[PDB]
Amino acid sequence: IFGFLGAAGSTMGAASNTLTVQARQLLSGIVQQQSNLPHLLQLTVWGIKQLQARVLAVERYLEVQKFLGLWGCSGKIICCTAVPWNSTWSNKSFEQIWNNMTWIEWEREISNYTSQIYDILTESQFQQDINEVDLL
């Protein structure tokens, strides 16, 4: 049992069984309350930053949903598609990655091959689904 963000420095393999803690606090915070008590409180400079705060919460959460929506892994926590991994982004073996290298370092290590990969997943999903229509 861990806390929120409580294992970021731990190894990737042992940090793969606490994702629900982070995933459970993307919107559920404190902003949901309107005000402590209700002359047009909606225009006070303190009250004009909730609008910036509230719309930033959704507009940051939706970006996660859009990528999960297209890849076919929508409505799941740990999914896995069927696109090959030709090792040009990272050729390290199974054990050299999972058990020893931490999550933050791994994200930085391939941060420059992300945009190519993010386009590969959607195309893999789409052309796979074209087979289904061309199957029945």
């Binding site: 309107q34 209700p38 002359h39 047009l40």
Partner: protein, 472 residues
Amino acid sequence: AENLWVTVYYGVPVWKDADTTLFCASDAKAHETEAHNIWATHACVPTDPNPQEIYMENVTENFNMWKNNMVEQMQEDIISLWDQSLKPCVKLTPLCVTLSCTNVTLTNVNYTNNFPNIGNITDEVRNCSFNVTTEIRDKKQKVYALFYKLDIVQMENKNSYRLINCNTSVCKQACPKISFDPIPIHYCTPAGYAILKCNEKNFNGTGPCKNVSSVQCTHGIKPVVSTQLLLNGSLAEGEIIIRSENLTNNAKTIIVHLNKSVEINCTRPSNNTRTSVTIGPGQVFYRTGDIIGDIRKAYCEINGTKWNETLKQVVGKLKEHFPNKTISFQPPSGGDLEITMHHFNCRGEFFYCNTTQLFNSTWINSTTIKEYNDTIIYLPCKIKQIINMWQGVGQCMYAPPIRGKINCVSNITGILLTRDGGDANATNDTETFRPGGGNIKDNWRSELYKYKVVQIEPLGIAPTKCKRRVVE
């Protein structure tokens, strides 16, 4: 059967109480008239052509009165609209001038077709003048004007007056373009919230309602303003009913709601012309120019038989709330002019009707029928120009004069009462109901006694006999 497993559901019909902001929605048939009404401005969304109503059969909900958060929201709405509609108008700071004031001498037709014969404006307005600067050294002129006695006071230096509110705070003159006509408003909640409407007829303040039907959002509401008698309201469908937060607690007000309206129709018979003078750069200022022709007090007419019958019905309704106590009515006992006087707006100017012959009566035991004739009731109704509608939150506003004869007719539906706490009259029993009083909110809680704001919670959980088929 321990083999049960949970089964979430979507769109479950379950709600819970909450508080939520509401947006205006004005009717299309009355808008786009370019009048730019103060209350329902152009920013309201177009209302749905066919508002719906879904009856709910097996439902009980613990409604409440005097606790609705909706009334505070719409109070804030009205305050903000009244403030914003006045900001782009002209100020009246250069009116803090020592006015030299004398009486009025008006000659006209003496008969003046005096049917009511109540009186005349003479010795009630003060024909005033004040100096204006001129190029020549120590030479001043007179810019005459007519002002009502309620807007001038004398401090010292006999034969010298000034505006009553020019010293306490700042006063603005409302631009004539904006209209005070109350346009009906439909309040409508954002998607994800339902409005519950109790359709039970004999529904007092609180208590469960077993006839409630859910609508998307409310019907029309009139933002009309009054102090002693409610106007233009919606008649109670069932019967004449009485409402209060607590009857025995005299502090809280008591609101009378009728089922048959009584028409009030009265007018200003005076004749006026709007004379314009220029003060400051491009900031014109109007004044009561002259009076010629008809000179008579602003009477008000109420049908006698209807009023007496309505009072008999209302006292009959009150009788079962106080077993062995006779009911009597007395005029307002004092206070400022906003309480002891009836107050209502009419096409951009504000009346002040006496309303004492209506509220002076008694009902000892209703033993016999005290027969009377057909009668017409006349109410001498005064007029004020400088008005601060609210105690310390409203901007002092100077209603410009209105040309010609102005007539207003309205429906009377609500009456505001208040009890008196007698102590030693345990057997010398009677009850006095002094009218008037009540905040501006009580003028509006009479229409928001059907609606409760709830929040849908469309996620529900219940056990079933289903288990997920794990894939391999």
